Amino acid sequence: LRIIWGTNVSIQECTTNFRNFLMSFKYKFRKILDERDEELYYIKQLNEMRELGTSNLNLDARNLLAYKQTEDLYHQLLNYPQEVISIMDQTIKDCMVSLIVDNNLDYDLDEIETKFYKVRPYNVGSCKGMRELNPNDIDKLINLKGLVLRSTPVIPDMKVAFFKCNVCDHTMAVEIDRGVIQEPARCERIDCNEPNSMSLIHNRCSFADKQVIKLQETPDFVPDGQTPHSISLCVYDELVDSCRAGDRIEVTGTFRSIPIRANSRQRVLKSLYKTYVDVVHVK
């Protein structure tokens, strides 16, 4: 039944549990509200999505509770949200593609399925302010509130790095991929070799927006004497710049912390890692 290594959440079949969950809900969530629209929330809204070709579905959270199945996926999503969104953004594509095959030719035609879809899940439990935050919480979805202190100018980021050699000169390049850029000493054209320095024209290589926002949350319930702590955020794409500064917001995301070079020359990193928000979803 496979598995994911650290996630211990098996590949696929969660996509299936996701689908029959996506395929049928109605209201089992109203069972928690104790009733007092009969049709399921998604297939209507899933249809609402297909015409516009907007993608970027905002999910719900929590409809995995109280409903079955996905009760563990509700957990497994909260355990490893990053990987969960990875399958789910893709499944939505097929869940669209699976929806279109019944209506057959749709949106002229199969290319609209080629368009990427993704989940922007919100309302994960209730996170407690900021200052409460645990180390153990390293990556998990977090409900948060605060008005933006400052909005930084959009930051460009690496996707696929562009490369060349002394010969021929030739344009062969490799994606930035991981947090590292590995360029072969040689070579493309003449092949050969020869061992020329690898030319990099950065205007050719791929880019995307990551926009830093320092945010001071006002969770209230302030421990006293605790300081009005603030929050770091990076975000991505539409999440970038879509958030006005100075606005109290429900924006949610996994926790993140990453090291930085002490000298900013020497390879040495300073101990403990600095932390920022993953900005999973906005509200």
Binding site: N136, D139, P223, S230, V268, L272, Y273, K274
Partner: protein
């Protein structure tokens, strides 16, 4: 090598003391089986992480290794000198004596411990088909260990490490030492999780990499150290795996001197300390505590050849913390001593500021703002205060500033302030560079800090314009507006407002007409519901009797008598919000009557006309408040019935706020 870095003998040896450690570890008597057994399983039970230890019990088992032999060298005398060797080696025996299961791990529970078994699931399977590196004992811990030293009744046993000390009392020989000092907290910059060992992963060859990191920095490994990638032409790539690598929560604080410990000269000494583990979030800035911890230097980075010599500069680490000054169920009865006593509106009115003599009528109204209420919700919506703004006008000081000293102290959200004093920038969120951790984080206070609570104020005439406009808006209340910088925010200030201010120089002149004597703007006084004129004319009878009270102290510490028993704040305060839950609803009977006396007040105040005693015009805001007054007054009666005497009781305080100008 020999010579340089010589091996040096010391009479102290833990070789059999480690055995003597496990003799003390687990097995124990004084507290079925020993406390250390099921408690160490209690950590194996995983409902606990932090491990708390004290010097108290070491002495008895050391007495147990004593009396009661066979005789053994003392651990504790080798502790305070080092004790960092005891934070590990004494603790390293815990894997030997800890129970295996000790119960079910389930799923969550938590991550980590589900992964850490997977890390050991991957670690053990490395050697499963392999037929030998293993995860170090330091690599997997999951539980913190703490020490709390003995003062104590053990020190008078007779038996030191617990003697409270100043920063000034801090010797250089105390480095490495587990020590205890009293001091005021400062800073308390935010805590963050810190990794002891990075987990790199080779991908290609895989395995796991663990590199130790100490202090502020480290030098990260690269390439692949994995032996599968060793001696093979292809070394696997690796970078840190944050899910894999272990973290530790790290807080810190500066600790100021109590100032009584200080020499008459010099300066208060701030002391850097660093909070870690379950011990984190145990403190706030400015709190007084007897701090107990080991003291170690953390050089260097650098620089380096700069320092030289080294001149350690060190720091203190926190082992343990002892803080100074740490329904409507059964506390209703604690309300009931004065409930059966009655006179809630007076005895408590007399309860106010028993330290200052007379002016109980002034104190009488003090009780109202200390309670206030209850607001309103129009549904428009526009919410109305809801809050009392009182001013006190008289000079010289009269010790008026002292009334604010008592009021804010008792009052929840009590904030004492003065003209300069806190500025309007102090009452707003103002950007400032944060020392150490960066950067330019905003820190608000005053009005923003005093919201949903009383704000006492002095030098109210010297607050100038910058403050006046803010509090001018603070009279619009429920808001603080900043259009400054990129900040457009308007934040709620629920602050209760009272400021006493001095008359025009030098003191008030009876010939001077009202509002000519006052230094405050009219629009500033109009939104005020009450002001008590503090003009003091000498009365030989009153002067003696007050002087008599001024004779009565310093004579003794206890003032009140002949006769009275002022309520203590804790039991007194509990009735406040308890009464604040009431929200009295107005009876229409008193309702229209207040309207009647209003047009009367709308008549008589206007028939005063030009200058003189004043003040007109008897605007509805005061009636809007005067109605709230009986609403605040009803709360002391609770019962939410709003009596007419309850209504008229405020109207009695209305004329009294003035008309003393004849005196």
């Amino acid at each position: 090598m020999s010579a340089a870095l010589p091996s040096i003998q010391l009479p102290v040896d833990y070789n059999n003391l480690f055995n003597e450690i496990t003799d003390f570890l687990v097995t124990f008597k004084q507290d079925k089986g020993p406390k250390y057994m099921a408690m160490l399983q209690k950590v194996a039970n995983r409902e606990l992480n932090s491990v708390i230890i004290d010097l108290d019990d070491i002495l008895q088992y050391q007495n147990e290794k004593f009396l009661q032999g066979t005789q053994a060298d003392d651990l504790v005398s080798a502790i305070q000198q080092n004790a960092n060797h005891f934070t590990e080696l004494f603790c390293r025996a815990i894997d030997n004596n800890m129970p295996l299961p000790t119960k079910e791990i389930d799923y969550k529970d938590d991550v980590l411990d589900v992964i850490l078994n997977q890390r050991r699931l991957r670690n053990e399977r490395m050697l499963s088909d392999r037929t030998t590196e293993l995860f170090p004992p330091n690599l997997t811990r999951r539980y913190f260990l703490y020490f709390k030293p003995l003062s104590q009744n053990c020190a008078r046993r007779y038996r030191i490490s617990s003697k409270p000390l100043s920063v000034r009392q801090i010797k250089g020989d105390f480095l490495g030492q587990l020590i205890t000092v009293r001091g005021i907290i400062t800073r308390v910059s935010d805590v963050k999780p810190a990794v002891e060992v990075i987990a790199y992963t080779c991908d290609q060859c895989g395995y796991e990499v663990f590199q130790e990191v100490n202090s502020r920095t480290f030098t990260p490994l690269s390439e692949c150290t994995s032996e599968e990638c060793s001696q093979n032409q292809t070394k696997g790539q690796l970078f840190m795996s944050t899910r894999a690598s272990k973290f530790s929560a790290f807080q810190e604080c500066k600790i100021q001197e109590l100032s009584q410990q200080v020499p008459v000269g010099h300066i208060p000494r701030s002391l850097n300390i660093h909070v870690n583990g379950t011990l984190v979030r145990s403190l706030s800035p400015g709190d007084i505590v007897d701090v107990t911890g080991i003291f170690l230097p953390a050089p260097y980075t650098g620089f380096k050849a700069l320092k030289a010599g080294l001149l350690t500069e060190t720091y203190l680490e926190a082992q343990f913390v002892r803080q100074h000054k740490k329904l409507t169920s059964d506390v209703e009865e604690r309300v009931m001593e004065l409930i059966t006593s009655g006179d809630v509106y007076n005895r408590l009115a007399k309860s106010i500021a028993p330290e200052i003599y007379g002016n109980l009528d002034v104190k009488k109204a003090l009780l109202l703002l200390l309670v206030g209420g209850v607001d309103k919700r129009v549904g428009d919506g526009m919410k109305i205060r809801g809050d009392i703004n009182v001013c006190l006008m008289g000079d010289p000081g009269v010790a008026k500033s002292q009334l604010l000293k008592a009021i804010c102290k008792i009052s929840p959200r009590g904030v004492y302030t003065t003209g300069k004093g806190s500025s309007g920038v102090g009452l707003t969120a103002a950007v400032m560079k944060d020392p150490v951790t960066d950067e330019m984080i905003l820190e608000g206070g005053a009005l923003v800090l005093a919201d949903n609570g009383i704000c006492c104020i002095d030098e109210f005439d010297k607050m100038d314009e910058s403050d006046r406009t803010a509090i001018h808006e603070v009279m619009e209340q429920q808001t603080i507006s900043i259009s400054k910088a990129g900040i457009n925010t308007t934040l709620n200030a629920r602050t209760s407002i009272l400021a006493a201010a001095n008359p025009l120089y030098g003191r008030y002149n009876p010939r001077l007409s009202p509002l000519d004597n006052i230094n405050l703007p009219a629009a500033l006084l109009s939104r005020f519901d009450i002001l008590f004129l503090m003009l003091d004319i000498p009365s030989r009878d009153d002067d003696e009797k007050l002087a008599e009270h001024v004779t009565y102290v310093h004579m003794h510490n206890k003032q009140p008598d002949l006769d009275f028993t002022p309520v203590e704040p804790s039991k007194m305060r509990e009735y406040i919000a308890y009464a604040k839950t009431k929200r009295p609803v107005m009876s229409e009977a008193v309702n229209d009557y207040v309207v009647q006396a209003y047009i009367r007040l709308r008549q008589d105040s206007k028939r005063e006309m030009d200058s003189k005693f004043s003040f007109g015009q008897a605007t509805p805001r005061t009636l809007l408040g005067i109605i709230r007054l009986s609403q605040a007054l009803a709360k002391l009666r609770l019962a939410d019935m709003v009596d007419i005497d309850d209504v008229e009781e405020a109207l009695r305080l209305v004329r009294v706020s003035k008309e003393s100008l004849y005196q």
